[PDB]
């Protein structure tokens, strides 16, 4: 019984970043070395446990995160990272188990006169926690004078869209992004690698 | 403290390849990502290569139709070839560690300091 | 890509004096600012990481600050044996770029 990885990484559309999509995975077999000998990834890093012998341990269950961000940010998705992504939009705990992969979706994500489809927080009260997803599109209050709706003078939409054109520098391009996670509960373990 | 030794020939004729190797002891070729870097005499460091043993490479893009390198995890070594070379390639060759990541895998995203260096092996461009 | 320039290119200064050699990157590159001591006939040996990290191994006179595009590495209490060419490298994106070195004599 083979793991849906291929509807994960394969998909038409991806999230936009701060409603990223996760897919929980359970009852099947995955073969991830299979998965890592792509020549096609910008981006393979494991915390924890290894790409190439990633096939030998059970878990409880793997959620695979996905989403676009710009080709600069990528370094924003790990452990103990800074920055507009990695505070307001996608938030990986310090303790992190698992991977992280990226690849330039140049050919699918820009188009003739910019895709500005996808969209990314700009403004929050706080930080994210790990793993949260805020949804939420209610006008940010930068300054002392409050908003009740409507743009104005210190008072922001949050969200704010990437323009990805096709000529646009590398750090500029699209990049298609999916985080493993690998959690053990006390509780049977579904998710196994061909041993 | 791992090391590195160059070696490979001080003298390449112009037009021919430039061929030399690293071989590394203390720790695993699989362990760490690893560069060429190179100096022309009273010049300043210039960037070669870089490859993690996945495969995956980067090259500097002036050198990049003339630049290849390898590893080979049984000898652990990894190895450079320069390709047609002029008197413009004569310098100084050094291969080098980058500091240990705290995962697995490659990310062109990300890119470390080289805290371990080998001595340095001359090679002259000339007929 | 992302160009290094150092400044001062060269200087000599006195035995126990404190130095500042400064590398600005062309664009922004947050704290991912290496700086190297090379001696001659030797390679370079990493002194500083992470624009203000000290290297095992290297004495507490040598240290770093900067963010952005402006970084400095300050010798303070300069010895005789600090003779050398000192470079930065930014470790922000690829291709790896060095600033162009700056050398240090002794006076004396």
């Known amino acids: 019984n083979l793991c849906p990885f291929g509807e994960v990484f394969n998909a038409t559309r991806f999230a936009s970043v701060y409603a990223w999509n996760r897919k929980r995975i359970s009852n099947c077999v995955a073969d991830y070395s299979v998965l890592y000998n792509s020549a096609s990834f910008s981006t393979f890093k494991c915390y924890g446990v290894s790409p190439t012998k990633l096939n030998d341990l059970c878990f409880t269950n793997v959620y695979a995160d996905s989403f676009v961000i710009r080709g600069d940010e990528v370094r924003q998705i790990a452990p103990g990272q800074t920055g507009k992504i990695a505070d307001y939009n996608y938030k990986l705990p310090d303790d992190f188990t698992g991977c992280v992969i990226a690849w330039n979706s140049n050919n699918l994500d820009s188009k003739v006169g910019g895709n500005y489809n996808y969209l990314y927080r700009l403004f929050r009260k706080s930080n994210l926690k790990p793993f949260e997803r805020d949804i939420s599109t209610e006008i940010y209050q930068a300054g002392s004078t409050p908003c009740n709706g409507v743009e104005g003078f210190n008072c922001y939409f949050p969200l704010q869209s990437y323009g990805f054109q096709p000529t646009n520098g590398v750090g500029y391009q699209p990049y298609r992004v999916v985080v493993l996670s690998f959690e053990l509960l006390h509780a049977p373990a579904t998710v196994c690698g061909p041993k | 403290q791992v090391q590195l030794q160059e070696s490979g020939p001080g003298l390449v004729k112009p037009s021919e390849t430039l061929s030399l190797t690293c071989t590394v002891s203390?720790?695993?070729?699989?362990?760490?990502?690893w560069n060429w870097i190179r100096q022309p005499p009273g010049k300043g460091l210039e960037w070669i290569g870089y490859?993690?043993?996945?495969?995956?490479?980067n090259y500097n893009p002036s050198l990049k139709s003339r630049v290849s390198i390898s590893t080979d995890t049984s000898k652990n070594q990894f190895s450079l070839k320069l390709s047609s070379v002029t008197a413009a390639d004569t310098a100084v060759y050094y291969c080098?560690?980058?500091?240990?990541?705290?995962?697995?895998?490659?990310?062109?995203?990300?890119?470390?300091?080289?805290?371990?260096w080998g001595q340095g092996t001359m090679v002259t461009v000339s007929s | 890509d992302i160009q290094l320039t150092q400044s001062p290119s060269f200087l000599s200064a006195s035995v126990g004096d404190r130095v500042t050699i400064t590398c600005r990157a062309s664009?922004?590159?947050?704290?991912?600012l290496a700086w190297y001591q090379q001696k001659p006939g030797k390679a370079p040996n990493l002194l500083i990481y992470?624009?203000?990290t000290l290297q095992s191994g290297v004495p507490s006179r040598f240290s770093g600050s900067g963010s952005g595009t402006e970084f400095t590495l300050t010798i303070s209490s300069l010895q005789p044996e600090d003779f050398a060419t000192y470079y930065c490298?930014?470790?922000?994106?690829?291709?790896?770029?060095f600033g162009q070195g700056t050398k240090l004599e002794i006076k004396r």
């Open positions: 490859i993690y043993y996945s495969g995956n490479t």
């Open positions: 490298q930014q470790l922000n994106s690829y291709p790896h770029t």
């Open positions: 203390g720790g695993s070729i699989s362990s760490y990502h």
């Open positions: 992470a624009a203000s």
């Open positions: 080098v560690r980058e500091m240990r990541r705290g995962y697995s895998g490659y990310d062109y995203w990300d890119l470390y300091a080289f805290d371990i």
């Open positions: 664009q922004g590159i947050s704290s991912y």
